Structures are given as C-alpha cells and as structure tokens.
Amino acid sequence: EAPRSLGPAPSNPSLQALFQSQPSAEQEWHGDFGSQPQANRFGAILEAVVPPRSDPTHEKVLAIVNALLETQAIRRDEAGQMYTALLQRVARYNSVNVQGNLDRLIQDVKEALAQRESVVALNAFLSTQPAVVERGQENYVAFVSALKLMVTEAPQSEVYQAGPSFFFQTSRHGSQTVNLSQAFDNLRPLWGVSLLTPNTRLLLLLIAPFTGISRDSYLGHLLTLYRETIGNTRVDETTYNEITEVSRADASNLQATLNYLL
Amino acid sequence: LSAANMLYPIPPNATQLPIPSRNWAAFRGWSLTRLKQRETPALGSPFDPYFTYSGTIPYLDGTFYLSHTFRKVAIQFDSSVTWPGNDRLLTPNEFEIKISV
Amino acid sequence: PSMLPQWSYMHIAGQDASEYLSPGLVQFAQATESYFNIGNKFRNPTVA
Amino acid sequence: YNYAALAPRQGSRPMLSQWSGIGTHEMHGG
Amino acid sequence: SKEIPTPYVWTFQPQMGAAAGASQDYSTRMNWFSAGPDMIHDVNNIRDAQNRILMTQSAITATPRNLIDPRQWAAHLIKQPVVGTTHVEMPRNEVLEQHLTSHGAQIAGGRSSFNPLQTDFAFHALPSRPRHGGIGSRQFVEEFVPAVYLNPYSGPPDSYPDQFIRHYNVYSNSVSGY
Amino acid sequence: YYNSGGNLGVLAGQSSQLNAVVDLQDRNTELSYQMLLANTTDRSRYFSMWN
Amino acid sequence: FDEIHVPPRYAAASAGRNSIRYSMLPPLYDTTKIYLIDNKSSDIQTLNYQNDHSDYLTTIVQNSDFTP
C-alpha cells in the first residue's frame, strides 16, 4: 500500500511531473506587488515582458517515468536509472518528431491510466467445463449465472488457473480459496438429485448470498438452508455485539456468551 | 502425572531461560525441580555410554532432593506480560521461593 | 484397505508430488530447478 | 508476480521446467 | 490435507497491539497412526467440525476489513473503555471568604456556615482523541480468530495470504531483516 | 555412529527437545548410502572431498 | 494574459549528422583533429617488429588512461 510515486495524484503522470520538477510558485493545489523592492520588481517585470523559454524535455521524460512507475513496468528504486537512460536516448535522437511522439505518448498513457482507474479465466474455465448434464440443464445454468454475477460484482476477486485446476479467491490478500474444478466435479453427480467436501461446501456458502435455483432440487434445498444459516449468522452477530456492548457497562463474559451462542 | 518432561542443562552457576512459542490450549501448570547431570541418564537411546552411575535416579524414580536450591522463578508470555500480572502476588513481577535478607 | 490413510499421509500409495503439494510450491520448484532444485525433497508414490 | 521472475529468461519466455518434474522415487534393495 | 487443513492460530504481540504472524496449530493435534479407518473417519469429522466452528466464529465476531491485520486501527473500530461521570463538589466560596477575611475574619477549614449556596460539577473525563492505534488482548482474541486456509498457497505469489509471516510489513510490501 | 545403540545423534530443535532422528538397528544406512551413490553417480571416478 | 506564446528551446541531438563519437568520452561535433604520430608506434612495438620507419602501425587513440 506504499505510494508508487511521490506525487499527490497517483494518476495524471503529467501532473505528477508538474508536482515534482516545477517551482512551487506556478503550481496550484486546492503580496501587494508594487511595494516590493526595486530588484524584485524589475526582475518580475522583465521576466513578464520577455518570458524565458525552456526545454520541456526533462519534464516530459519525468512524466513518462512516473507513468511507468504507476504501471509497475519500472520498480521504485530504478526510477532514476530509467530516467537517465531515457534522457540519454532522447538527447541522442532529439528532433521535433521525437518531441511530438513524446507528447503523444504522454497523452495516450495519461488517458489509459485514467480509463483503467479474472473474467477471461472464468470464461476459459466454463469452456473447459461440460455444458450439458443428464440431470436437468436449469440448476446448472442458474448456478453458472450466479457464479458469474458474484465474480463480476466482487470488488477484488481473482479467478486463475494453477496447473490442471481453476481456483477462486475472495480477495488478493485473503484466506478463502475455492478449487472450482473439484467443486464442480463433486457437484456434477448431484445437480438435480453431508456428502459434500469442505471445498464445495465453501463454494456454496460463498455463492449463496449471490443467488433462479428451483427449491425442489437438492442444490436448491442446500442453498436455502445456507441462506438461512447466513442470515442467522448476521442476526447473531448483531445480537452478540449488542449484548457485549451492554455488558461492558469481562473476557469471561465474552467466553460465556460465545459458548452459549454457538 | 500427565506432562511433557523437558530437561534443560544448567552450567554450574546462575540462571537460565527456556521455551519458544506454542498454543497453550488446555494447559494445566508448571512443575519444576532440579536434578544432577551425573545421575540423569539419556532418554531416547537404548543405552547410555556416558551414564556410569548407579543408585537412585531422580528423573525416573521420584527422588527429588534438590528442590530447595531455587531462589526465584519468573514466568512471562511474549516476554512482556507476567502471567500472574494482575497484581496477584506480594512480589509484583515474579515468584520468589527463597529470600535471604 | 486398512492402511490407506497411513500410506497416503506417508506418500507410499497416495497422490503424485505434482498434485498433493501447493500449486504455488510446484510453480516455485519448476521455476528454480535450474539452480536450487526443490524437486528431490518430495516423494511421489509408484503403485503397480 | 508469476514466478517467471525467478527463472532464467531465454530471450522472453522463461526456461521453466516440467510441471510433473517435482518429486522423486529412487528405492531398491539390490 | 487441502480439504481439511489445520487452522492457522495467530500470535499476539502485546507491545504494538497487533498480531505477529500466524502458524498452523501444531500444538493441539491428535495422533492417529495407531487408528484404523473407523476412527480415522471420526477424527476427520471432528477436524471438519472444528473448522466449521472456527469459520462461523470468525463470521460472528471478526469485523469486516480489507486487510488481514491493520497495524494501525481506526478509532471507531477500537472498543474504547467506558468512563463514568465524575461528580465534584466545590468546597469553598472564594468571593464570600475573601469578603469575610477583608472584614477581619480568620477561617480555619477542615457547607461551612457563612456559605448558603452549594454547587456541584458533573463532567465526563473523555480523552481528547479517541485513542486510535493498537488492539488490546480482549479485542485481539475476539477478532483474530484462528484462520482456516482451505486451498493453501495456490496461485500467483501476490495472491498469497501475507501477514502469516511473523516479520512482514504491509507498507512497502517486503520482509524486514536485521 | 549410524544405527548404533547408546550413540544416537539428534537433530532436535530447541522447542521441545524431541529428537527428530530414530535408529532401529535393523536399518543399514551405510549400505543404503553406498547403493544410492552407486546408482546416481559414476562411482568409478575418484572424489577427494569425501573418500 | 493568454495568447502570449513562447516557443520551447530544444537542444540539438547528442549524436547528429556532424557528431564524432568516441567510446568512454563525450561525443565531439563538427570538426576535430586526428594525429598519426610515428612516436606512438614505438609504444606498440609488438605490432612493428618487421616494420621500418615508413611502413609502421600507429594508434589514433591518445589518452593517458590506457596503455597505448
């Protein structure tokens, strides 16, 4: 969770380069000229009348390297190395066409970063999974639809292939991984029909809040009971919080309530 | 006697400090006693070439004559909190067994 | 089959090393077999 | 990561080993 | 076994008020090499039931959060200790005592006699800020319940559950050495 | 001392003083190592790091 | 105060048409001087055993950092 780049705006690499390599008198992030001394007044007047032209090459390269840092194509500690290498290359092949290409690349990378600021793996997994079963092609179809809906609506969830099996993980740094291949292999003999492994039990518990299934089928009954259990768990959490907060005006009290409550 | 017997060697002076982390579920307490190295045999091996001793064996005979040579014992969890830390004892931070002054 | 749990815990007649280990561990071993060679540290059964 | 950062890169593709290469069985009494 | 794993019991660090890594529960485990399949089934069922109990206990007590172990906790998540109302009574009336002394009277204190009024002050001695930071032992054991990691270490390295490693900081993800 | 009696080596960690090495006097680790070398390496070539 | 356009002042290419590049030294531009001194041929005698004072071998690179 460390800041990838120094600038206050993680996106807009041009803005980040503005923040890093520009004087803090032109920037904006949100006196009495005439009483100033003669030297300052004359310097400001001359600079205003005849503005000093400067090369926007180092700024462009800094914006590019900030974009690369944001994209993670360049590690944090080699930013200076890449900056110097890019400056050397640009100076070696400097031209108006090269400057135009640099500006175009900065604009394109800024747009791409702004636009950007698992599904294909699930599609491949569904493709390798058989789509026809001899025990009702509606429970399977609705379950697949629920799985796709939940993986799409999950904020940070990953589906990936690890050798010969496909896995589903609820979060990047979590501890809830479901072997989808084995779960569906276990579920296949009993679509339309205690005997389920913990992997497929966890899959069902995860998909229950995000699910068309006919209630007559075994999977329908299991999903209804899992929904009921999850609702009981939420209401039990609310009751536990209320009881504990009231009883704290003892860890032994938490022990007693949890034991009586589970 | 339901317990895990640990024998920590003692150089012929001073103090010592045992044990890494664990879970400590269903723990029951500590029993502590001092034995002489010449008298305690080797446990795992079927033979003890370095034993060269007969008579009562304190370790496996129930003959603990050196229990009186303990000054104090201190117990801490994660090296920060003393186990009887709720101001239980007269001595705030450790179990004292003998006091000379 | 009164000893299958034991022969599966100690990999005598259980599952191959490529698929009872963590898939990440298998990927690590196959990536760093050129110099570090984790592969010989795990036994995989051979059943007639 | 991909664990391809831990393997030599013969150009672009990593020099990964076989998936089933892990594991060994060498045991005979004679 | 990946299907029924041993829970990852957390370790508490009572100086920073945060968990210091997690390791599998290698202390509370039952040997079954002396048992045939009849009892192997029972032991496996017991382990599965224990995993289920741990999962539901996590769902009940653990507060939802993106990170596994936030080193610095938000103020509202931390259960602040309740404080009672402090009642204090003003003993002496300074202006009337000053008037009496100026008119030539000595008061040797120990309601006095000359003060008919009687005022009391009630207020709550709350801390200025609601003590954001570490986690006490009670909240730690309430929330950092043992974790059941079903499919262990399967996927890309960045998808692994970190903070199970004892020496690992979330900021600038890496392992802190000597 | 391999597969001996009283002379048993230990790899026990400091945790519980529980030895990780067990010998049975019915196992021949010397012959096992000799066979392992003869099957893995070309033993006809002399090596000096070990005899 | 807009419409006051100041064009940028770019720098010429470090390796242009007139650039003369020598490794481990900053590049030179336009003209330069190359000296084929015969006295330097006496520092590489290994290459000039059979070479007289008219058919010798010399080295252009004249820097004290390296042996000739």
Automatic annotation (TrEMBL), chain G:
Domain of life: Viruses
Coiled coil regions, renumbered to chain: none
Localization per Swiss-Prot or TrEMBL: Virion; Host nucleus
Note: All late proteins expressed from the major late promoter are produced by alternative splicing and alternative polyadenylation of the same gene giving rise to non-overlapping ORFs. A leader sequence is present in the N-terminus of all these mRNAs and is recognized by the viral shutoff protein to provide expression although conventional translation via ribosome scanning from the cap has been shut off in the host cell.
Function: Major capsid protein that self-associates to form penton base pentamers, each in the shape of a pentagon, situated at the 12 vertices of the pseudo T=25 capsid. Involved in virus secondary attachment to host cell after initial attachment by the fiber protein, and in endocytosis of virions. As the virus enters the host cell, penton proteins are shed concomitant with virion acidification in the endosome.
Quaternary structure and partners: Interacts with the fiber protein (via N-terminal tail region). Interacts with the capsid vertex protein; this interaction binds the penton base to neighboring peripentonal hexons.
Family classification: Belongs to the adenoviridae penton family.
Protein name: Penton protein
Organism: Bovine adenovirus B serotype 3
Gene name for this UniProt entry: L2
Shown residues in whole-protein numbering: 30 to 97 of 482
